[PDB]
Design a protein around this ligand. Structure first.
Ligand SMILES: Nc1ncnc2c1ncn2[C@@H]1O[C@H](COP(=O)(O)OP(=O)(O)O)[C@@H](O)[C@H]1O
Ligand SMILES: Nc1ncnc2c1ncn2[C@@H]1O[C@H](COP(=O)(O)OP(=O)(O)O)[C@@H](O)[C@H]1O
Ligand SMILES: [Mg+2]
Ligand SMILES: [Mg+2]
Ligand SMILES: [Mg+2]
Ligand SMILES: [Mg+2]
Lengths: 263, 263
């Protein structure tokens, strides 16, 4: 009788061939359900992450609210079952960006894509957005994650050259250097593994747990980080800002990139 | 202050560049520590798995006990820190079995390797083996894992054509159909990901959490499973037994393969 999914959800997915996603970049369990005529995806998060930006329930609320606003998968079924938040969704439309630009010398293409994403985001009306992921909320969550050992451990943070010696040290800095915020729609984890492209245009967004209201520099900083991680040429960072048509605010960019090292 | 590893351990791995292992087949956190002189491996399991066959402390004990008996990595450092069990070990010698066979069709070489491991395991004197992984012990921990929702993430267990409707039904079956046991040294998870080869002969064994005393058919069953899903041809299973010089006991083989489903 003890199961992580309900009998109702089990019936909906029995006909599919379960292939667990190998990435495992988050505490969530992700499953591709290979069917005869389509694939579905089931994302699950345990009770320890209930209410946090990692909670897939969060992720369903944003998916529903984002329908008609951004290209997102369809919510086929959601439920809370024995502490688990279970989200059954349709397969995103298009090609995963990390795949589309995998072995391809064209950093400029993903830059153009990021620019496009930031553009689309700034057009989204957040007046009735389900979640506000301002720094007060994010830091309170981070505090909880740290205290309960639920924050992700970037094993690279153990290397001797890392600035902050421990998670709290970084947290105290984030708490102290909290920049001013101007809320706009924020994806929360604008990476090439969460974005889909079809015919040059963005075709889908997933991993929406941190989606909601947040400063504009949050997603922008994420992009700066991605640009630098893939290529050691800072010229592409300037290209990105040329495309956005704005001046980089390095203090805010550094801040949000730092905030991410605990997520 | 609060960290998953102690300052002593942190100090020991500072000089190393961390590269987290992407497999993530178990609840253990595995990290490759790349250095200029050599590479080390850091394996970690949290508080919830304490005392179970997943606990790296148990794995460390077996790693220590197997020195001079089987080619295993050297225990460089062990500690219990803030609920975590951490093990710093040397890199195994040789080539990963799944890598040496990567694509190159050489089934009989793998069959001979598996055969070699079984014969090698049977020559091991278990008179002072630290652990006895009898079925009572294994089922007892399985009961605990299920009671705390720590048993293997149901993915295929959700599919329609699965024999057991739920984990408990499977557990109950194992409890009732528990066969007789003849304890020999058992690796606990004999597979191409936990075995290393050099010059066609086994050069290293890792993932020792479930190692100790257990029935001989346990590891043999795992090889049968590996042969079928890695090689494909059933003739190679017959060959496996030819090399072992024994006739397969399918009733026991099915049982042990079934035992690992929930782990
Ligand atoms: N609805 C979906 N459509 C297509 N691919 C998906 C879908 N959901 C998940 N995936 C795939 O699985 C990976 C992990 O999903 P994601 O929601 O990003 O989980 P996490 O928060 O761990 O990153 C994604 O990078 C993508 O490859
Ligand atoms: N000491 C080691 N030397 C070399 N590779 C190792 C070592 N420890 C772990 N690995 C690598 O990391 C993978 C996961 O480690 P393992 O101990 O098997 O963890 P788990 O129990 O999750 O399978 C192994 O398949 C192997 O590729
Ligand atoms: Mg993601
Ligand atoms: Mg995510
Ligand atoms: Mg292993
Ligand atoms: Mg293991």
């Amino acid at each position: 009788a003890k199961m992580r999914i309900s009998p109702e959800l089990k019936k909906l997915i029995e006909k599919y061939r379960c292939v667990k996603d190998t990435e495992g970049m988050s505490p969530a369990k992700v499953y591709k359900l290979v069917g005869e005529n389509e694939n579905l995806y089931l994302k699950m998060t345990d009770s320890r992450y209930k209410g946090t930006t990692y909670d897939v329930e969060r992720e369903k609320d944003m998916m529903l609210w984002l329908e008609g606003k951004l290209p997102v998968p369809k919510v086929l079924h959601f439920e809370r079952h024995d502490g688990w938040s279970n989200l059954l969704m349709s397969e995103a439309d298009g090609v995963l960006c990390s795949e589309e630009y995998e072995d391809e010398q064209s950093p400029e293409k993903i830059i153009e894509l990021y620019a496009e994403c930031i553009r689309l985001f700034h057009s989204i009306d957040i007046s009735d957005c389900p979640y506000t992921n301002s720094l007060d909320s994010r830091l309170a969550e981070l505090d909880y994650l740290l205290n309960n050992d639920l924050a992700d451990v970037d094993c690279e943070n153990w290397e001797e050259d890392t600035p902050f010696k421990d998670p709290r040290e970084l947290y105290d800095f984030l708490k102290t250097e909290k920049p001013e915020e101007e809320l706009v729609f924020s994806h929360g984890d604008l990476g090439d593994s969460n974005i889909f492209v079809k015919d040059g245009k963005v075709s889908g967004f997933i991993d929406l747990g941190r989606s909601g209201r947040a400063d504009k520099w949050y997603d922008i900083a994420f992009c700066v980080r991605s640009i630098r991680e893939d290529i050691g040429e800072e010229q592409y960072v300037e290209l990105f800002f040329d495309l956005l048509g704005i001046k980089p605010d390095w203090e805010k960019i550094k801040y949000y990139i730092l905030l991410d090292e605990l997520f």
